[PDB]
């Protein structure tokens, strides 16, 4: 799966973090992003933890900080950033 975003929900976590449509996640917390499932599980499990993202906007790197919104979940407090993945 291509680690590109399609849209960012307004007034969400990825909105205040600076993420935009077309941005490509490259690194998360230092280590590169080879599996999109790792970033998905990091956004899911961590509910209010600062995640350092190295993205490539327009082909150029940029450093942002993402703080997932603690969306209510039955099992446990879940993390929602408001990112729409790339349409397959």
């Amino acid at each position, epitope marked *: 799966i291509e680690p590109v975003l399609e849209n960012v929900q*307004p*007034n969400s976590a990825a*909105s*205040k973090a*600076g*993420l*935009q*449509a077309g941005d490509r996640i490259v690194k998360v917390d230092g280590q590169p992003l080879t599996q999109w499932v790792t970033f998905v599980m990091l956004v899911r499990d961590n509910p209010g933890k*600062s995640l*350092a993202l*190295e993205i490539e906007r*327009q082909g*150029s*790197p*940029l*450093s*942002l*900080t993402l703080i997932p919104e603690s969306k209510p979940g039955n099992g446990k407090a879940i993390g929602f950033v408001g990112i729409e993945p790339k349409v397959i």
Partner: antibody
Amino acid sequence: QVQLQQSRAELARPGASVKMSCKASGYTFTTYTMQWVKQRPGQALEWIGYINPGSGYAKNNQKFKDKATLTADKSSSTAYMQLSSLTSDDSAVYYCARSGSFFDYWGQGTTLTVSS
Amino acid sequence: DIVLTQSPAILSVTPGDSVSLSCRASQSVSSNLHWYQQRSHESPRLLITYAFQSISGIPSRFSGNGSGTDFTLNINSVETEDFGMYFCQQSNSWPYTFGGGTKLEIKR
């Protein structure tokens, strides 16, 4: 809680070089992108460029291709901007800003006067 | 090179009316446009992020709308601490560019 301490005012001889600082206080300095913007007295803002502390990647505007040189130091938590080959058109107020998309936290302003 | 055009450059308003500042672009920046307020002899202040999304710090009277290649910043009841320069900055492509600037003066 989050402050950007910029260098004090500067006077420079024409043709020399200057190197101003922007010490960040109150956040993880390596995860947020630093931005440098120019403003001449009475005119609009002018985006000089940005830099990623920790990785050292600096991307400047095409006008500030070689005029501006962006560096970063993680330990001192300080981003430096160097201006080489100074002319009269370099007299302006220079700001540093936080974040890589929108500029949330701004600095005080380093005023550079280039005269002999 | 996305050239943000901020028109007009100066607008005089009686301290109490509404203000709609324009900021037309040249290419599709979608909703990647933010507004900044600069008071005289000060540093810029972040007002609205991404066209309409409000920031945690600005009063309720500051809002805005627009998309693509047309944006508008709305100030409802203008107080005395609202005059000065206003700039629009796009973050869609490279390089980042600011607006021409709109000056808010008091009417007399």
